Write a protein that binds this DNA or RNA. Structure first.
Ligand SMILES: Nc1nc2c(ncn2[C@@H]2O[C@H](COP(=O)(O)OP(=O)(O)OP(=O)(O)O)C[C@H]2O)c(=O)[nH]1
Ligand SMILES: [Ca+2]
Ligand SMILES: [Ca+2]
Length: 1203
RNA sequence: GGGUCCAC
RNA sequence: AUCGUGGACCCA
C-alpha cells in the first residue's frame, strides 16, 4: 500500500488518469491535490509521445457549412470504439467548430491550436489520436453528405437547390469521382498513359491506327469514369451526373470527399497465430460429446487481452487436457472457441453474417488504469449485439500496491456493467495477471484457472439442437400412391417420432397433421433426429396443400409472420455483392430456409442511402408469411445473387414492368431473320475482308484452309480464326459428306485395338535379348498405378460415387433422361453387372428393378465437324449407375498426381506458358479413348480393378445397321468412366516417360486427352504411344511452335488466339445474337472495339428486329441479348433499386414428373451428401421439375448490374 | 437437375 | 432423335 485510497479517487474522477498514474503521481506530489495534476500534465506530452508510435487508421470525419462556406474534418484515432466515444466526439466537434468560425485550412494551425488539449485525451483514452487533414470549400450553393462517420463530402454548386446538392453529395460519397469533368484530368497522367497503353496493344502486332483508335477509346471511358460528369448518377444510373446537371441548368464549382483512414497503411492483424507467438516463449519455457462454447475477448488494446488469451491457453492445457482466426482451449468439461473483438463494426458484421456469434464475452480491464472512457463502448457493443453474459478479467494487478485500490476499480466496472443492464453486482471479476501466469507463477497461475472456472459455471451450457422442439424445413413434397403425402428435408432441431402430431406452417394458412412414418434411402425408421435428412410421411394432407418454404414443426412451437426488424450486412462489391448503393424503396428477395420471398423495407431514422459493406438495421415486411422467431438468419438476394445477410431481431405485428413491351420483344424473338444464302459464310467473309485477308470463295474452302504458324501474333490470330470459324458449320451443302465417315473411323479404331490386343498378349519375341521403351513404361506405369489406385475400388468409394445422371439410356430416351425417371423405370443391365444391381437391391427397401439383362449398348452418331460426326454409345442405365461410381473414385485418386478433372483452367495456363516458354508441349491423341484396347488396360490396372471394369463395361454394341460389334476397346465414348480412365492411362504413361528420362513426373498434366508434359519428353512419349496401340494426332500436337493449345484455349507466343465457331445455320434472332456476341468477345478488349471487326458487327446487327438491336446486356450474362452497355438499354427496367433487363429464353411447357421416382431420387441424393467469411451455407438444392422444349422463344426479365 | 454457351 | 464429364449464365 501507499497513500489514502480515497485521495487517488478524488484525483482520478477529476483527471481521468489511470489508477497507478494517479497513485505514483500523488506520491511524488506528497499528497498535494492541485499539485499532482500538473506533474501529470507535463507528463501527458511524454505519454502521447510514445503513443504517437502506434498506427491510428480509424477515426471520424466531420462536416460543417456556414451559409455558403463549408469545411471537412478528418480527426482520427486507432479504434472503432474510441471513434464513437463521447470524449473523442467532443474533441473532434470543437476542433471543427473552431476551424469554422476561424476559417482555417492549414492543418498545422489548429493541429497546434489544440496540441495542448490533444494530450489531454491521449492521456485519458490511451490511443494515438491526431488531426490528419483539413480542407474547406466555398461556392454559391453548397451541401454536405455524412455517411455515418466514415465518409463526408462537401459539394459546391452554382444553379442547384437544396435537394440537388444533397443528392450529388451522396453520389460523390458512393462513386469516388476524382475530377469534376473529363477534361479537368491531369493532361499529364493521361499523356503518359496513352504512350504506355499504345504499346501494350501495338506489341500484339496491331497496326498503328488500330491500336491508336483503341487506346483513344479506352481513355475516353477511362476519364469519363473517374469524373463526376461521366458517371451514371447513383440515384438514376440511366443518365449521368453530367446530364443530370444540364437538366437543372446548374453546375458544380467543385467538391471534397474524405474517407477515414484513406491511404493510411492499415496493418493486418492475425489473432490466432498472434497468441501462439506468446505461448511460445513459455511452452518451450474419450469425452467427444462435450459442448462447444464461443467466448469473446474485449477491452483496451494494450490492457493485454492478447496476453490473457495466451495465459489462458497455456495454463488450460498445461493443467487439464490438451470460426475464422480463433484460438481454442479445453476445460475438463467444455470446449472453448475464443475470438478477439477488435472493432465494433467488425463484430456486428460477424454476428449478422453468423461467422461468429458469442455465448459470453470477457471484458479485460487493467487495474493499473481502470475502466477507460471507451470501456463503455465495449460494454455497449456487448449490449447491442446481445451477448448473454459478460465476465470481467481484472488484469495487471501485481502492479497495485494497495488492494484497497483494486476494491476501487472493480467498483467502477460493476457500476458501468449495470449502467447497460448487465448484472453488475453479480458478474464475476477475477483479479489477476496474465504475464506472471505465463511465467508459471503458481499464484497468478491459479487466477487464470479461476476465470476458467467461471466460464464453466457462469456461461450456461448452449442448448443442444436435439433438445429443442421439432422443426424440419420442407424442401419438397411428394404424393405417392399407397403411402400418402411425404416431405423431405434435413431435420433442423429436435426429434420426430412416428405417431406424433405436427403442424405445417409457413406460406399458407397453417395446417396440422400426424407423422405416419420416417424414411431414408437405405432403411425405414421410427424417428428422425436433428441433423438427419429424411422423408416424413403425413396423414390426410393433400400434396398441393404443402409447399417448399413451409416448415414442419411441433405444434404451436413456431408461428407465421410477415413483419419484423433486423440487422443486416450488405455485401461489399469485393465480396460478390452489389456495387451500387440503394435507397428508400429497396425491393430484393429474402431467402429464409429453403425459398425466396419478396419484401419491402423501411430504413432507420435519418438514413437515406445504403452502400455495399454497410451494416444496417431495417424493418422488413414480406409479401407473405414465413415461420420465424428471433435469431432466424437469412440471406438477401437479387435473382440468384446473394447481396446481403441478416438475422431477425424482433418480430412485429404485421397487418415496374411492361405489357405490350415484353410482348413486343417476344414477337421480335419469334421472328425469323431472313436472308439469301449462307448468312454465316457472308459474315465470315466480311470479317476476313475487314482484316485484309482473302475471303473463302466457296463452301469447300471453309473447311480446307491451313494457318501459317508464323507471322506476328496479330496476323496469326485472324489466320487461325479463318482456319477455324467455319470448320464445324453443320449446314454445308456442297459435300456428299456423311456420318459414314464417322463409322469408318469408329471401325478403324476397333481394328487397331484388335492388332494391339493380339500383339500385347504375346510379347515373347524369341528371348530376353531385346528390351524396349514401351514394354518398360508399361511395367513402370503398372507399378505406379497400383500405388495410386488400390488392388480394388473401395466399397466406400463406390458407395459415394454411384448415381444416375443425365440423358438417354438403353431403356430411356432424352425426354426420360432425368434421374427420377431412371429410378421410376426399370433400367437395363449387363450380364456381368447384375450382381451390382442385386447388391444395391439388398441395401434398400425401395424397389430396384431391372428391365432386361442384355450385353448390348446402342452405338449412335453425334455431331462434330463439318466433315465427320462422332460415334457415341448409349449405355444400359444400371451399368451407367456403376460406371460413374468408378469414374468418381478415379477422379479423386488422380488428385494425388496433381491431376484435377474439375478444372480445365489449369491446362489452359500451361498451354499459355508453353507458347511463351517452349518448355511444355501440348499433345493430342487421334481416337483417344476409342484406341485404349482391352490388352493395354489389362496390363496396367490391378486385376481387382480390371475385373470390375469388365463387369461394368458394355461388351457389345448394336449399330444403326442392326450389326453387332464385340468391343476390342476397353470402353466406348459414353461410358461412365471412359473419360477418367483415359486420363489415368495417359498420365501414367507420360509420368513413366518422365521418370525414364529423368524429368519430374509433376510436370505432367492431363485432362482427358489434353496432355501436357515437358517438350523433351515428346519423342519418347510418341514412341511409347505407338507401342501401346495409340496414334498421336501429329496435326494437333505442338512441342516446338510459338503455338500451344489446351482445353479450348489457343495461344501464340502468349497472346490469346482462341477463335470462335459458327456452328449452325443462322435462322432466328437468338442464332444471330450468339454469333455477334461471339464476335464481340473475340474482337473486344475490355469493352473496346477493334475497329476492323466493329464495322462487320454493325452491319449484321441490322438484320435483327429493331427492338432487339438496342436490347443490350453486360458480358457474363449469357446470350439472350446483345452484349453491350446496359445503362443505354431502353428496355432496362429499374425496379426497387434493382435493374431488370429482358433476355430471350427458350420457351418451355410443363410435363408431369414421376412422383415415386423423384422421391427416390431425393432420398438417394441426401444419402450421398452424408457419405461425403462463409455464409453461402444459407441455401439448398432444388425440386425435380420436368419440362419440354417447344421450339419458340420467350422473354425473361433478369437481375442485372452495370459490371 | 433443365435451357444456353464454351470445352475434353 | 442427341452418351459421359467439366466450367460459366440464366432459370429453377
Ligand atoms: N462421352 C464423350 N466423350 C468425349 C466427347 N468429346 C470428347 N470426348 C472425350 O475426350 C477425348 C477427346 O476427344 P477429342 O480429342 O475431341 O477427339 P478424338 O476422339 O481423340 O479424335 P480426334 O482428335 O482425332 O478428333 C476423347 C473422349 O473420351 C464427347 O462429345 N462425348
Ligand atoms: Ca484427340
Ligand atoms: Ca486435345
Amino acid at each position: 500500500a501507499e497513500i489514502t485510497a480515497s485521495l487517488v479517487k478524488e484525483l482520478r474522477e477529476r483527471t481521468g488518469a489511470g489508477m497507478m498514474d494517479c497513485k505514483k503521481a500523488l506520491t511524488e506530489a506528497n499528497g498535494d491535490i492541485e499539485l499532482a495534476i500538473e506533474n501529470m500534465r507535463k507528463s501527458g506530452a511524454i505519454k502521447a509521445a510514445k503513443k504517437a508510435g502506434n498506427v491510428a487508421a480509424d477515426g471520424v470525419i466531420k462536416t460543417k457549412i456556414d451559409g455558403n462556406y463549408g469545411i471537412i474534418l478528418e480527426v482520427n484515432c486507432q479504434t472503432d470504439f474510441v471513434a464513437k466515444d463521447a470524449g473523442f466526439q467532443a474533441f473532434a466537434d470543437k476542433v471543427l467548430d473552431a476551424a469554422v468560425a476561424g476559417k482555417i485550412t492549414d492543418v498545422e494551425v489548429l493541429k497546434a491550436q489544440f496540441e495542448e488539449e490533444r494530450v489531454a485525451l491521449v492521456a485519458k483514452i490511451g490511443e494515438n489520436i491526431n488531426i490528419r487533414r483539413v480542407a474547406a470549400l466555398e461556392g454559391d450553393v453548397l451541401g454536405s453528405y455524412q455517411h455515418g462517420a466514415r465518409i463526408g463530402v462537401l459539394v459546391a454548386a452554382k444553379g442547384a437547390d437544396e435537394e440537388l446538392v444533397k443528392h450529388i453529395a451522396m453520389h460523390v460519397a458512393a462513386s469516388k469521382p476524382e475530377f469534376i469533368k473529363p477534361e479537368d484530368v491531369s493532361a499529364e497522367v493521361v499523356e503518359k498513359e496513352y504512350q504506355v497503353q499504345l504499346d501494350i496493344a501495338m506489341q500484339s502486332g496491331k497496326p498503328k491506327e488500330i491500336a491508336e483508335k483503341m487506346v483513344e477509346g479506352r481513355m475516353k471511358k477511362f476519364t469519363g469514369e473517374v469524373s463526376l460528369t461521366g458517371q451514371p448518377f447513383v440515384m438514376e444510373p440511366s443518365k449521368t451526373v453530367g446530364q443530370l446537371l444540364k437538366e437543372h441548368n446548374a453546375e458544380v464549382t467543385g467538391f471534397i470527399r474524405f474517407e477515414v483512414g484513406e491511404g493510411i497503411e492499415k496493418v493486418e492483424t492475425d489473432f490466432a497465430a498472434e497468441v501462439a507467438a506468446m505461448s511460445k516463449q513459455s511452452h518451450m519455457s474419450f469425452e467427444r460429446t462435450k459442448p462447444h462454447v464461443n467466448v469473446g475477448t474485449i477491452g483496451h488494446v494494450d490492457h493485454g487481452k492478447t496476453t490473457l488469451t495466451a495465459a489462458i491457453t497455456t495454463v488450460l492445457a498445461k493443467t487439464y487436457g490438451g470460426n475464422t482466426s480463433h484460438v481454442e482451449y479445453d476445460t475438463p468439461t467444455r470446449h472453448y472457441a475464443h475470438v478477439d473483438c477488435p472493432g465494433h463494426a467488425d463484430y456486428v458484421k460477424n454476428m449478422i453474417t453468423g461467422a461468429a456469434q458469442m455465448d459470453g464475452a470477457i471484458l479485460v480491464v487493467a487495474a493499473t488504469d481502470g475502466p477507460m472512457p471507451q470501456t463503455r463502448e465495449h460494454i455497449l457493443l456487448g449490449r447491442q449485439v446481445g451477448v448473454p453474459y459478460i465476465i470481467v478479467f481484472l488484469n495487471k494487478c501485481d502492479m497495485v500496491d494497495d488492494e484497497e485500490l483494486l476494491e476501487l476499480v472493480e467498483m467502477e466496472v460493476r457500476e458501468l456493467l449495470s449502467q447497460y443492464d448487465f448484472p453488475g453486482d453479480d458478474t464475476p471479476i477475477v483479479r489477476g495477471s496474465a504475464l506472471k501466469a505465463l511465467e508459471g507463477d503458481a499464484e497468478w497461475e491459479a487466477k487464470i484457472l479461476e476465470l476458467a472456472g467461471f466460464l464453466d459455471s457462469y456461461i450456461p451450457e448452449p442448448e443442444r439442437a436435439i433438445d429443442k422442439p421439432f422443426l424440419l424445413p420442407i424442401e419438397d413434397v411428394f404424393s405417392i400412391s399407397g403411402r400418402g403425402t411425404v416431405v423431405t428435408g434435413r431435420v433442423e432441431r429436435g426429434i420426430i417420432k412416428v405417431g406424433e402430431e405436427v403442424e405445417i406452417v409457413g406460406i399458407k394458412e397453417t395446417q396440422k397433421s400426424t407423422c405416419t412414418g420416417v424414411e431414408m434411402f437405405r432403411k425405414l425408421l421410427d424417428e428422425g433426429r436433428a441433423g438427419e435428412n429424411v422423408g416424413v410421411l403425413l396423414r390426410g394432407i393433400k400434396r398441393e396443400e404443402i409447399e417448399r418454404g413451409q416448415v414442419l414443426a411441433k405444434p404451436g412451437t413456431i408461428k407465421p409472420h410477415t413483419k419484423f426488424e433486423s440487422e443486416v450486412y450488405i455485401l461489399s462489391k469485393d465480396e460478390g455483392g452489389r456495387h451500387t448503393p440503394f435507397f428508400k424503396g429497396y425491393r430484393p428477395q429474402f431467402y429464409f430456409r429453403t425459398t425466396d420471398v419478396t419484401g419491402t423495407i423501411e430504413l432507420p431514422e435519418g438514413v437515406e442511402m445504403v452502400m455495399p459493406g454497410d451494416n444496417i438495421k431495417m424493418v422488413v415486411t414480406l409479401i407473405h408469411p414465413i415461420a420465424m422467431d428471433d435469431g432466424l438468419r437469412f440471406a438477401i438476394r437479387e435473382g440468384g445473387r446473394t447481396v446481403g445477410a441478416g438475422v431477425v431481431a424482433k418480430v412485429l405485428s404485421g397487418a415496374s414492368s411492361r405489357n405490350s413491351l415484353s410482348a413486343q420483344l417476344r414477337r421480335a424473338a419469334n421472328t425469323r431473320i431472313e436472308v439469301e444464302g449462307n448468312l454465316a459464310l457472308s459474315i465470315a467473309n466480311d470479317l476476313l475482308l475487314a482484316y485484309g485477308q482473302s475471303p473463302f470463295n466457296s463452301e469447300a474452302e471453309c473447311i480446307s484452309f491451313s494457318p501459317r504458324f508464323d507471322g506476328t501474333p496479330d496476323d496469326f490470330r485472324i489466320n487461325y480464326l479463318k482456319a477455324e470459324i467455319m470448320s464445324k458449320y453443320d449446314d454445308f451443302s456442297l459435300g456428299i459428306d456423311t456420318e459414314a465417315v464417322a463409322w469408318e473411323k469408329f471401325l478403324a479404331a476397333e481394328a487397331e485395338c484388335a492388332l494391339t490386343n493380339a500383339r500385347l498378349y504375346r510379347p515373347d519375341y524369341s528371348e530376353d535379348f531385346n528390351f524396349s521403351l514401351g514394354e518398360s513404361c508399361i511395367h513402370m506405369a503398372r507399378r505406379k498405378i497400383a500405388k495410386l489406385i488400390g488392388d480394388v475400388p473401395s466399397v466406400e468409394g463406390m458407395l459415394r460415387h454411384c448415381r444416375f445422371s443425365g440423358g438417354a439410356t438403353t431403356t430411356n430416351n432424352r425426354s426420360y433422361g432425368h434421374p427420377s425417371f431412371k429410378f421410376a423405370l426399370p433400367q437395363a443391365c449387363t450380364p456381368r453387372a447384375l450382381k451390382y444391381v442385386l447388391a444395391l437391391r439388398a441395401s434398400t427397401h425401395f424397389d430396384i428393378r431391372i428391365s432386361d439383362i442384355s450385353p448390348f449398348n446402342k452405338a449412335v452418331t453425334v455431331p462434330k465437324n463439318s466433315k465427320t460426326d462422332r460415334c457415341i454409345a448409349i449405355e444400359p442405365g444400371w451399368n451407367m449407375f456403376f460406371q460413374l461410381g468408378i469414374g468418381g473414385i478415379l477422379r479423386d485418386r488422380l488428385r494425388c498426381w496433381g491431376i484435377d478433372l474439375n478444372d480445365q483452367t489449369i491446362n489452359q495456363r500451361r498451354a499459355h506458358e508453353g507458347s511463351v516458354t517452349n518448355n511444355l508441349a501440348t499433345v493430342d491423341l487421334s481416337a483417344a479413348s476409342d484406341s485404349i484396347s482391352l490388352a493395354l488396360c489389362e496390363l496396367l490396372l490391378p486385376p481387382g480393378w480390371f475385373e470390375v471394369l469388365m463387369d461394368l463395361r458394355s461388351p457389345k454394341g448394336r449399330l444403326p445397321d442392326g450389326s453387332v460389334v464385340t468391343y476390342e476397346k476397353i470402353s466406348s465414348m459414353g461410358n461412365g468412366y471412359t473419360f477418367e480412365l483415359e486420363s489415368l492411362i495417359f498420365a501414367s504413361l507420360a509420368r513413366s516417360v518422365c521418370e525414364i528420362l529423368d524429368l519430374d513426373s509433376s510436370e505432367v498434366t492431363v485432362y482427358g486427352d489434353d496432355i501436357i508434359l515437358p517438350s523433351c519428353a515428346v519423342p519418347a512419349l510418341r514412341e511409347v504411344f505407338k507401342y501401346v496401340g495409340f496414334t498421336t494426332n501429329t496435326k494437333k500436337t505442338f512441342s516446338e511452335g510459338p503455338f500451344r493449345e489446351s482445353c479450348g484455349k489457343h495461344y501464340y507466343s502468349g497472346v490469346d488466339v482462341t477463335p470462335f465457331y459458327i456452328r449452325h445455320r443462322i435462322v432466328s434472332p437468338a442464332d444471330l445474337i450468339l454469333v455477334l456476341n461471339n464476335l464481340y468477345r473475340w474482337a473486344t478488349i475490355d469493352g473496346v472495339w477493334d475497329p476492323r471487326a466493329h464495322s462487320v458487327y454493325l452491319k449484321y446487327r441490322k438484320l435483327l428486329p429493331k427492338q432487339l438491336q438496342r436490347n443490350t446486356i453486360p458480358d457474363g450474362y449469357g446470350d439472350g441479348a446483345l452484349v453491350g452497355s446496359v445503362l443505354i438499354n431502353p428496355f432496362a427496367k429499374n425496379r426497387g433499386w434493382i435493374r431488370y433487363v429482358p433476355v430471350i429464353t427458350d420457351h418451355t411447357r410443363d410435363r408431369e414428373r414421376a412422383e415415386l421416382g423423384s422421391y427416390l431420387y431425393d432420398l438417394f441424393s441426401r444419402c450421398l451428401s452424408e457419405s461425403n467469411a462463409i455464409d453461402q451455407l444459407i441455401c439448398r438444392s432444388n425440386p425435380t421439375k420436368i419440362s419440354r422444349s417447344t421450339g419458340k422463344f420467350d422473354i425473361q426479365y433478369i437481375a442485372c448490374s452495370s459490371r
